């Protein structure tokens, strides 16, 4: 009953099971630990970062090793459009003979790989199960490096100080230039040297790379300035990927669009992209001042940025010390940027597939988009939660105020009511009218008169599609016109490739849109606005409100303030995160439902099914869920089973976890404490069991813990059931 | 970089004078015990108790390897594979083309014998109050003192004799595995070569 929460003496003195539960959930909140200083905080965070990167590299190495050992990578190379990639083998003693037979792939039961790693590794120039093994070996070596570094930087003479950790200019210069630019430069080097010849049949391994010229002229044009030579003779339109037939000699080109065979971006396009990004980031990494008297001091930049007329208060004067001294502000900024970035990855890796033969891998396309959108929602909610935490525990009004006037951040708490009221107005506006149009379509179609539907053509979005060259909406605007200056400017660089790809019905590049797209985009906007409303309200109201003008004194996460003053359930800022998680899950569900149904109709060919039935709710319920759930639920029946049996089991498992979350959310404490007391009496008053007694007094889960557990069940069930549905439906419908 | 100190003066390494002399074995033992208590206090890790137990097991296993070689040579060690219909799909190793290669029955029998011996060990582990030599160290008990580079030359059924023979057997197993890995033959093939041919005859 002691010594487990070593970091908290208050918990270690708890005589109940709450100590164990809270010991888990407070282990990473280093700022709240006993005998805590800032130096130890930054050092522990640094070591934890090292361990985390080691974990990531070990996970990647495991994926590589299992593809190399139990996969069919080599067979998939020779026939990427017919051979289904294998993730890893299965050894489960609970299998019957039927399950073994159904999951049997080649030599052993195995799982199909939906991560798209086969296409990614094939694109970057891997052709052998020994290339994957080398990658796994190297990644385990890197993990060992990172673990050694993490141990080393906790040693006495190697523990960095607060000044080093808060040295913003040095870290920015190095991160930008070194990390981004130099990693892009090295990736361009690999892309060219290995990937470009490997796509043309020439093997460039760790033996013949110092003697195989990536370009026939060989670094002469680069120093000579004849950089056009690297773009001459690109890959033709009859080039077979991985073979020298119809190949070229160029390494950096503009082509635009996709490879005619793999239906993916040109490797020479991506090498040029990464070279440009490398140059730009290396240049941008010299901005801030270091030991050589030139550069920028960001404190001065922030302080000097006050509009002269005066509408942002005193400007950004106090922001430097605010951000530097708070790890939650930086964490929130990083999480918001990462969420936007992974939303970008999801939205671009389906419209512009970058890996060979990934466009025809429909289950992996759906899985990748869903995975990245869910990660995006999680990251955004985390960014807002950490902003709220910064408000609660790191924000100092004195730093952000100069002689009564407030800086740009402190002024966000002055018109907080205006911000929240207008977020509420936008959410109500969008919800009222999107639901009104959807229900109008529902009722009108149900009454057998679909012509009375309200169908709004998304002209604004179709205008953008025409601006990028789509000649489908008869707009003749910028790139849909051959005479506009936008078209004449790039008529010789990348329009022929771009136009040939955007004006193609088999791509996902700028999918044609209609009224259903309009309505679902408005639903998405409503979801985004409502999630933002909850999170922003929790962040701004974190320090106090009218119901609790001292909420900052109770911390970020506390159960309530009691039944007084009318009742104060879910009044903390943590509860705002807890409520906004449901809205994030709902919004990501809407986004992924829209994406998956649109792409299922596109792949099956019945795009008229979406364009007609997507305007009313029953259309969704009947033609997406009810229609495509048939293959999934018949993964095992009283007659047999298929390789989709695991997905049906996961479907039911997700439903069960969802409803257990419903348990933990609807039923609150107090009802579970008295029942536990009855159980305690029963155990204490029964023979043959009195010999065994608990060391920690069994008590009901706390209010905040119960909310967390219900949210965890809700989210896990949500994710599992939707992953099972999307994967099984795609597999069982599209062969 | 220049206007500040990367490492504070208050956080600097101090040379541990407590390990002066203290040959690498004593230094390693002290470092392990200080760094990992509650597993060192149990006798686990680089400890004389663990060394003695592992030596006993290595000697018994040299005996077991000789017995296994004899059984393989003398027509024992049942033939074929396990019945998947009888023992489920967990005994299936691979399916090449329409035939299920299962775990060899000889491997199953050897695993059952090893299970017998390991069960005996587990009973002795959860029988601490009735066994002559316990597996772990009692709280308070102190680990027997390391024997050193060369244990005392005391012939017979002595602690030093068992210690020396356990070290020799463990080194022999290490050498056997190293020879098998370097040259590439089976473990029993290496034992057969190292016995002239008198085992697999």
């Amino acid at each position: 009953v002691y010594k487990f929460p070593k970091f908290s003496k208050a918990l270690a003195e708890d005589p109940s099971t709450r100590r164990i539960w809270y010991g888990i959930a407070t282990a990473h909140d280093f700022e709240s630990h006993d005998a805590m200083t800032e130096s130890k905080l930054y050092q522990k965070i640094f070591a934890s970062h090292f361990g985390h990167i080691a974990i990531i590299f070990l996970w990647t190495a495991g994926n590589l090793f299992h593809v190399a050992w139990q996969g069919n990578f080599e067979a998939w190379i020779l026939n990427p459009l017919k051979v289904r990639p294998i993730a890893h083998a299965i050894w489960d003693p609970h299998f019957g003979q039927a399950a073994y037979k159904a999951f049997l792939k080649t030599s052993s039961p195995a799982n199909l790989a939906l991560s798209g790693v086969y296409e990614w590794w094939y694109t970057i120039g891997m052709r052998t199960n020994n290339d994957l093994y080398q990658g796994s070996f190297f990644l385990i070596l890197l993990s060992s490096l990172l673990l050694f570094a993490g141990w080393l930087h906790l040693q006495p003479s190697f523990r960095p100080s607060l000044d080093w950790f808060k040295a913003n200019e040095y870290r920015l210069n190095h991160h930008l230039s070194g990390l981004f630019g130099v990693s892009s430069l090295a990736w361009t080097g690999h892309l060219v040297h290995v990937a470009i010849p490997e796509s043309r049949g020439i093997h460039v391994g760790w033996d013949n790379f110092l003697t195989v010229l990536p370009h026939p002229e060989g670094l002469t044009p680069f120093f000579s300035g004849n950089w056009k030579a690297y773009a001459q003779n690109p890959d033709t339109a009859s080039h077979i990927f991985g073979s020298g037939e119809g190949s070229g000699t160029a390494i950096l080109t503009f082509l635009g669009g996709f490879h005619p065979q793999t239906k993916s971006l040109w490797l020479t396009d991506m090498a040029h992209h990464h070279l440009a990004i490398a140059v730009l980031f290396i240049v941008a990494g010299h901005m801030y001042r270091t030991n050589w008297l030139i550069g920028h001091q960001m404190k001065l930049i922030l302080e000097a940025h006050r509009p002269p007329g005066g509408r942002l208060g005193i400007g950004h004067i106090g922001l430097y010390e605010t951000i530097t001294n708070s790890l939650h502000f930086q964490l929130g900024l990083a999480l918001a940027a990462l969420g936007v970035a992974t939303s970008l990855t999801a939205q671009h890796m389906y419209a512009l597939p970058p890996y060979a033969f990934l466009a025809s891998n429909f289950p992996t396309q759906a899985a990748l988009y869903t995975h990245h959108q869910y990660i995006a929602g999680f990251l955004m909610v985390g960014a807002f939660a950490h902003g709220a935490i910064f408000f609660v525990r790191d924000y100092d009004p004195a730093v952000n105020t100069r002689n009564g006037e407030k800086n740009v951040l402190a002024r966000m708490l002055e018109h907080k009511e205006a911000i929240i009221s207008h977020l509420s107005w936008v959410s109500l506006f969008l919800g009222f009218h999107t639901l009104g149009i959807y229900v109008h379509n529902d009722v009108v179609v149900a009454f057998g008169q679909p012509e009375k539907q309200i169908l709004v053509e998304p002209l604004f979005a179709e205008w953008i599609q025409a601006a990028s060259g789509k000649t489908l909406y008869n707009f003749d605007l910028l790139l849909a016109s051959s005479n506009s200056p936008a078209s004449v400017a790039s008529s010789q660089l990348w329009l022929p490739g771009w136009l040939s790809a955007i004006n193609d019905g088999k791509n996902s590049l700028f999918l044609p849109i209609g009224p259903g797209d309009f309505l679902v985009h408005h639903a998405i906007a409503l979801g985004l606005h409502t999630t933002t409303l909850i999170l922003v309200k929790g962040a701004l109201d974190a320090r106090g409100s009218k119901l609790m003008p001292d909420k900052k004194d109770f911390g970020y996460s506390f159960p309530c303030d009691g039944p007084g003053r009318g009742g104060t359930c879910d009044i903390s800022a943590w509860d705002a995160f807890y409520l906004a998680m449901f809205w994030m899950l709902n919004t990501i569900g809407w986004v992924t439902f829209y994406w998956h149904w649109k792409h299922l109709t596109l792949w099956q060919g019945n795009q008229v099914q979406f364009n007609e039935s997507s305007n009313y709710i029953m259309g969704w319920l009947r033609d997406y869920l009810w229609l495509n759930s048939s293959p999934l639920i018949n993964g095992y029946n009283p007659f047999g089973m298929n390789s989709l049996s695991v997905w049906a089991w996961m479907f039911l498992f997700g439903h069960l976890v969802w409803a257990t979350g419903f348990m933990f959310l609807i039923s609150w404490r107090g009802y579970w404490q008295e029942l536990i007391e009855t159980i305690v009496w029963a155990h204490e008053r029964t023979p043959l069991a009195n010999l065994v007694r608990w060391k920690d007094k069994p008590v009901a889960l706390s209010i905040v813990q119960a909310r967390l557990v219900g949210l965890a069940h809700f989210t896990i069930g949500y994710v599992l059931t939707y992953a099972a549905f999307v994967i099984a439906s795609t597999i069982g419908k599209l062969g | 970089g220049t206007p500040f100190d990367t490492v504070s003066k208050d956080e600097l390494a101090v040379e541990n004078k407590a390990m002066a002399g203290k040959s690498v074995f004593e230094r390693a033992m002290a470092d392990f015990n200080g760094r990992y208590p509650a597993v060192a206090a149990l006798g686990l890790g680089p400890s004389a108790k663990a060394e003695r137990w592992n030596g006993r097991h290595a000697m018994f296993g040299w005996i077991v390897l000789l017995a296994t070689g004899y059984a393989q040579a003398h027509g024992l060690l049942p033939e074929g594979g396990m019945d998947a219909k009888e023992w489920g799909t967990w005994v299936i190793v691979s399916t090449t083309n329409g035939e299920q290669v299962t775990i060899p029955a000889a491997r199953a029998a050897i695993a059952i014998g090893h299970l017998h011996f390991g069960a005996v060990g587990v009973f002795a582990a959860y029988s601490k109050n009735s066994v002559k030599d316990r597996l772990l160290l009692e709280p308070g008990e102190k680990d027997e003192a390391p024997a050193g580079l060369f244990p005392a030359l005391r012939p017979g059924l002595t602690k030093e004799a068992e210690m020396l023979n356990g070290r020799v057997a463990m080194l022999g197993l290490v050498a056997l595995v190293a020879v098998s890995a370097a040259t590439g033959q089976d473990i029993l093939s290496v034992i057969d070569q190292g016995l002239g041919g008198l085992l697999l005859k």
Partner: peptide, 30 residues
């Protein structure tokens, strides 16, 4: 198909990465 030697040495290297992980884990304290 990878050999027994390839998998074995990868397992051995994985063990070394494990001992480095507990050293980091124990250094981040109990």
């Amino acid at each position: 198909m990878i050999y027994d030697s390839q998998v074995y040495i990868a397992l051995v290297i994985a063990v070394v990465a494990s001992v480095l992980a507990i050293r980091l884990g124990a250094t981040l304290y109990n």
